[model samples]
Target: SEDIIVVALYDYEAIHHEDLSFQKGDQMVVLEESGEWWKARSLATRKEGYIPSNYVARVDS
Candidate 1:
């Protein structure tokens, strides 16, 4: 499946407009990946933004 899922492992407060906020255990769909950040859409909110790569863990898909 192209739908790569991830779960947040820590709480993150959005520091910028392009960033996103997520609490521990939030489920998200990863849309893109880079060196340090991964773009994703929240399963809870359907809002998309940049997430810290280290703050999330890959979920079985």
Candidate 2:
């Protein structure tokens, strides 16, 4: 299922990166989900990151 990416840093440890910056209200598309890993593509910056599924929110209201 496709999901909208929401900042969920509190639930998980933040990945360290020099240019890594994700904030609240950020949007992304979930491409795949497996265990604790989720493949997502950022809609805002077109950047893709493997984040935890716990951070993603459903697009449907």
Candidate 3:
């Protein structure tokens, strides 16, 4: 079983010093949740990184 979610809004480009950058509508698998941020893996790229919790919504299936 996996907890999957989708990006609800757009985020800026990934700074060279930052982690993965994703766009709205992208699907991700939740890896960890901490405060206002979530560590997840992008379903499109299979890359893992952190994103704001407010930027994503739960996937209801």
lDDT of 2 by residue, 1-61 (tens): 4344445343333474512234555555666656776666666577676665565554621
Reference-based lDDT, residue 61, model 1: 81
Alpha carbon deviation, residue 61, candidate 2 (Å):
8.5
Better of 1 and 2 by lDDT: 1
| TM-score (all chains, Cα) for each model | 0.83, 0.54, 0.69
lDDT of 1: 0.81
**Runs in model 3 with CA error above 4 Å?**
1-4, 16-18
Q: Lowest summed lDDT over 10 consecutive residues: which window, candidate 3?
A: 11-20
Clashing pairs in 1: none
> Residue 47 lDDT in model 3?
81
Q: What's the distance in Å from true for residue 6, model 2? A: 6.0
What lDDT score belongs to each candidate, Candidate 1 first? 0.81, 0.54, 0.66
Candidate 1 local lDDT, 13-60, one digit each (tens): 778777778899788888876768888888788887888888789765
Give the TM-score (vs. native) of candidate 2: 0.54
> Distance from true position, residue 32, model 1, in Å?
0.9
The candidate that achieves the highest lDDT relative to the unseen native structure: 1
* lDDT digits (tens) for residues 19-60 of candidate 3: 567777666677765778767777777887777777677663
- The 10-residue segment of model 1 with minimum total lDDT is 1-10
Best by TM-score: 1
